[PDB]
Amino acid sequence: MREIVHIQGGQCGNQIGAKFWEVVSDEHGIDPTGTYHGDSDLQLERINVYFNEATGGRYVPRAILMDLEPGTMDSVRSGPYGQIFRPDNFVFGQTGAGNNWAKGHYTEGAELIDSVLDVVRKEAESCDCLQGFQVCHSLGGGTGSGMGTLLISKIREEYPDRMMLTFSVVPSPKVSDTVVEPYNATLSVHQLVENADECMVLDNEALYDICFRTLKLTTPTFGDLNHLISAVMSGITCCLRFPGQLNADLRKLAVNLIPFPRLHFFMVGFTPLTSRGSQQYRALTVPELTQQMWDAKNMMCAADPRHGRYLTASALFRGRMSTKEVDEQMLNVQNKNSSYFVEWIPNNVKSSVCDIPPKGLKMSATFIGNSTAIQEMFKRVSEQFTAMFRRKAFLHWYTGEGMDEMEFTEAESNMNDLVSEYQQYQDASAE
Amino acid sequence: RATKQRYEERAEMYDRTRQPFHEHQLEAANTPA
Amino acid sequence: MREVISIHIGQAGIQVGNACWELYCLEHGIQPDGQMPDDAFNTFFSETGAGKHVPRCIFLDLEPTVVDEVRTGTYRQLFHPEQLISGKEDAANNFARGHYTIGKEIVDLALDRIRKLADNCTGLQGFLVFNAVGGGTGSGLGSLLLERLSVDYGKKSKLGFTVYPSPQVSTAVVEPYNSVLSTHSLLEHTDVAVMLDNEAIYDICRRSLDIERPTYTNLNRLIAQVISSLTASLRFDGALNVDITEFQTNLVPYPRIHFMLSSYAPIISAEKAYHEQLSVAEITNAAFEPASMMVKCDPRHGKYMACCLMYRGDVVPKDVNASVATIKTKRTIQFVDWCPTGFKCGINYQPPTVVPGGDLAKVQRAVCMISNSTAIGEIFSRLDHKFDLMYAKRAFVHWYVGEGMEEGEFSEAREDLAALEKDFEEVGAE
Amino acid sequence: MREVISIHIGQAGIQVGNACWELYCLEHGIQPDGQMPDDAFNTFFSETGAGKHVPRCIFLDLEPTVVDEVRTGTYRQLFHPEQLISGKEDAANNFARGHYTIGKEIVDLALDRIRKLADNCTGLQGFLVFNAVGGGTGSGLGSLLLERLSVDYGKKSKLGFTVYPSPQVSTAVVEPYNSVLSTHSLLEHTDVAVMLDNEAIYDICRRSLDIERPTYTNLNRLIAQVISSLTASLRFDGALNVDITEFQTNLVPYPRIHFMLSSYAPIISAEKAYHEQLSVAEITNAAFEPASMMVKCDPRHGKYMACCLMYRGDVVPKDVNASVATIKTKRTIQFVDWCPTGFKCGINYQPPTVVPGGDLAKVQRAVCMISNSTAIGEIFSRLDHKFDLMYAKRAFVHWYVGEGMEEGEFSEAREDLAALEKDFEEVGAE
Amino acid sequence: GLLTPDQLRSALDRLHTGLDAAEKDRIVARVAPAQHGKVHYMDFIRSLESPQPLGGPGLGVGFPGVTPQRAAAAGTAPTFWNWQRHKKQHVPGLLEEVREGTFEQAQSDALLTSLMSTKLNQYRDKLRLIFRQMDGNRNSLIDREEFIRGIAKLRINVSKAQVERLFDLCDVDKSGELDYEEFVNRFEENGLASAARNQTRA
Amino acid sequence: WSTQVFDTIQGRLQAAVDARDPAAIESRLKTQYDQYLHTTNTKVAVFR
Ligand SMILES: Nc1nc2c(ncn2[C@@H]2O[C@H](COP(=O)(O)OP(=O)(O)OP(=O)(O)O)[C@@H](O)[C@H]2O)c(=O)[nH]1
């Protein structure tokens, strides 16, 4: 009865949202036609968190699909679970943003943002109680980044107290997809710092590394990456949807994770990710899950936690497990890696336990780390942004959309100040 | 739907056959090779 | 919704258009009669109530022979008879003739039909202008049409797939003259100018296709494959969809710098097919090889500013990332200091269709690499001295003067080309 | 995982490679078309997208006839078309021609393809260079390729299966010349050089196979069986697994002394098969018989330094131990005082496969004895005066000088071979 | 390990589960005997080890380790591989079926001969190389099967009837095998192919 | 160990291998190999 409004933005955001909604429909026993077919009352316990009931048994997602081009959500509708979504929640423009944050935020986003907010308000008013909004999108793309940040700002203005959760696909370090990725990421991070209460950083190259090393897949499409992302997005809110021995909502995670308002960027990891070959060979135990959680390779963010220091870290476990085992395992992890944990916080771990594991898994766990390692991710993006901005490469595309040059400088200054926050609390000593 | 499924199924079959079949063994692609 | 209007000006324009529309008909299943036995054709064809599909194309020429060849070839019932526009007198390789005296009424009627075609399009990604820089019809009339389109339509993306004179081999004498004039014209109007050279495509056909006697049909087939790979994301869905508007945003750093080198890979005949791996990394390396470039311009001389990759077929993003990372780590490929990313990758799930009776083989993977690089200043440097060597003696100048030009036009074209040279030098330099 | 790159240089190299690759295809079940109806082929074959297995071999030659025989023969669909590399002009039995003037571009292309092949291998045990010491292509080009491989690849173990001139019978006149030159070249570049003599193989065919008319195909079949028995432990499991890298560690007492006699047993036709016991002890004794050695060199003259035995088939460690104990106790076989063990026994559970149409019989046991012995300096003594007798008159020296050699190079090669003679005497000494 | 259901109830009582009689009966009935109380302790422990609420498998993506990216509804079947929306199209002007004395058939023959002559003659002696590649056998005479196989090696989609028409048109001298002379005569650059291509009204 | 054993044995190996003239070595090996060649050519078979 604590409703969450899901928003998908851009091509990447829409694909991730489709994967996530298909995963959630599987987990709640919802067929692609919307009817419940689970044969388990636990599935319908808290289905209102994500779905609304139709005239019959049909359940419609509380999802809002965004784009400036219709092709991506045409593919979304053609997908296996494209018919669950209410057709009124598909908001499209006609000319897509040419990977232009300016086009997606000022020129072409302005017309569509009125409809987007109308749909968001219509979905939010139907909620009995609103936990908040979760927005899945990708930094480094025009419509995704620009429209998502604009909508996040508008929703922050309308509903200040409600939670804002973001799943941003930050551009990957080593391989860049589009040229203007540093521009879009730099402009979007500035908005997310001010508006988004909670943010999860995902990198496609990190996802490739984890799916090739842990899952040991050799030709992973974007479907696999969206699958891992969807697993994380499900596991973060499984405590709202199922009874837990020690339950913890999104606001509780935000309170226990965010020491200071600007330091709300997190790296996430999901366990247990097991290769098909070693599925039988692996032992499902709480120590094994914790060991896989705290591995740097398990992180879906490019930055590795070893370079930084863990400011905070939440662990949402799922399964019928010993709270003694869980607490002892993460206390032992803290004691062993105290060099990687911040000193001026006596306990850097927020343990949450849900009694209902994901389908097929005896036990599972999602890990959400607020660490100063993300500083190097921002530093790299700024290294690219400065190199392009010094010579104003591709700057005319943003300038002709009615954005001042000073906006880029302000965004970079804000992002560098955030880097300074992370470094200062990394090297900050108690007393 | 047909095009996306064809792409994904081709990728899955190439995965199965690999387990172009030496590209997963390239030094740059993966350090263990 | 994603309609693109095709313009083919001059003999080269119409001849590459024949191959392009053959390729599109083969790709979308449209028979030569016009109709097919959804809505992926909307970018290139408009369906009527009868089910017949007519291309959104315009064949413009001042010579009747080339257009009548289309009217008499296999593709008679496909094209619109009025869309085929023919002049009465050829421009005779005179930019003045094609831009000042003969081209006026023909281009006015061209604007009329272009307006009628654009009124049939809900959306309009832009125009694809295929002309011949180096001939009066292509250069002069094409320049006039581009100017009128810029005046009236405004911000619509005009992508000009121009064919420039080759460095030493050529077929005309006043080719430097009308090339320089049309270059001055299209420096300020077209949005992205994709550069093409007959010598380069001949070398491609000789080395990759083993054709020691290449012909214009082969060249046009290669160009059509390149354009189809370029436009594939408009018609077929794929991971990392790339748009006509995304080309310029990910490829044009500065408005003056919009000329683009094109390279297709693989280019393998039937006999040589299925004998090498043809993996993503190998085809990316082949696309970045200087020999596979479709402009006689060694990229090693300059530095890449941006590289947009169109992958077609079974390409997985991890493989494209690995290949592009290898390219980045390669020392031979050099990028400008101010573009650390410099890459725009886009995948499409539709493998390139093979023209029956062509030399290209059926490949499950394909790469179209379109790059903005400062090396392209070399070809303009070649034309700038080929022009001035003639213009010192004012050879053939009276021919251009007779049809309504002045020496000032030649001087201004040469000065603007020098300015473009200096702009390329400046963007290349730190 | 255990890949080995095979190189075949010259007519003799390519012709023994035909037999070797026929043998490997028959052993692994690979049809000549390329594909077969676990992963035991990885040492020699890499599987492609269609499932076709391509050998990791490179057929290098300056003469087109020998390579075109493969391009036309039954193994046209197996080997890679670019793996078959053909020159334009033969080396004409001139080491200078094959190493200095013609061989340059060909060996550059060879290194290009070798790099492509090596980039297809996770691991790389080493190189198997099959050439003919005694011809320009075999000697000069092979020496150049070995030099380049040593320069760039580095630590890869290069095993050269060199075919040296027979003592009295021969088919070339400058054969001592280019043999001495190639011996000087590979004394420092190969890691393990295996000696083969056509006269000795002819004697083996005449006596053991009862072939009164042996030919090159027969010789190459025996050589291919020897090499397959050598590599059998890489591809098939068995007791006492033997490795390419440990050939050295168990066989090369000093780096200079790395020339090795080879002897196969049993060598019996079908009619003489199943007529004797062919036990392990008997076949080991046969392998240590002077007649079974594939080099015209009496082992009784010198003293064995090391003997590596490769058994194939139903062989038990007791049988190999008892046979080697009997051999050690035998008075005729004499080992050096400084190597009390001097034996490296290795068994494989895969019996030697028989090529249909050949003369070798289906034997459940086989031994390949490769011995480092100081007796081999005796054939070097033969070549050392066959060289200097002509070198006194400088016969055929102008032919070698014309393509960029010097009298100093002949002198240095002959002096190096004299130093090798001194080395053999010293290592035989106590 | 074969334990009766009553033995399982006694085991639960000994293990102090605290359940009532009915609850213990239901927990025992969770497993079903094979023949006569043939459920074994490992099976019972597997039944109670992972309770697995939510019902397990369903029509969706599921957990990353267990199930692939694709939907269970859009899965469990490999359909849509090698899916071609549009079938391969022949070269325009080429007749699939042979017609006697028709301008369409004449144009098809001219176009096909021109296509072959353009595919060949691309470099010097390429006609000779293709001729040598036509025949697997050692004789220069080209058989009908050799001709069809060579045309198939060329990336040309032409029916067997039209290939046989080409074979007969290339003068067999009524012998049924193509000689190099006639091969060259009909597959020369221009010549008969160009003349037939141009002579439409004939 | 070096000076007492290895240096002594290598010094005694030298001035003996060095003392042996290369021409004498060639002639000795030639007489041996020609004897083996002659017995191979005359006799039907050679046995150890
Ligand atoms: N790539 C390519 N270029 C061509 C082809 N046909 C002609 N060209 C080029 O086009 C140039 C001349 O084209 P046009 O100006 O259209 O010739 P036209 O139609 O007679 O018009 P004018 O020559 O101006 O009178 C020549 O220099 C050729 O290089 C072709 O099929 N492919």
Ligand SMILES: Nc1nc2c(ncn2[C@@H]2O[C@H](COP(=O)(O)OP(=O)(O)OP(=O)(O)O)[C@@H](O)[C@H]2O)c(=O)[nH]1
């Ligand atoms: N055992 C064996 N030796 C061979 C065979 N073929 C050739 N040889 C030897 O190889 C030597 C010459 O080989 P090559 O140098 O490669 O002859 P080529 O290919 O014409 O190259 P060049 O003579 O160097 O110009 C001859 O002396 C032969 O004794 C063979 O099939 N088996």
Ligand SMILES: Nc1nc2c(ncn2[C@@H]2O[C@H](COP(=O)(O)OP(=O)(O)O)[C@@H](O)[C@H]2O)c(=O)[nH]1
């Ligand atoms: N994980 C994932 N990432 C994607 C997908 N599609 C695109 N991306 C990434 O998202 C980034 C931005 O693209 P995007 O925002 O979708 O473009 P836009 O829709 O025009 O704004 C690109 O760098 C892609 O690498 C997808 O399906 N899954």
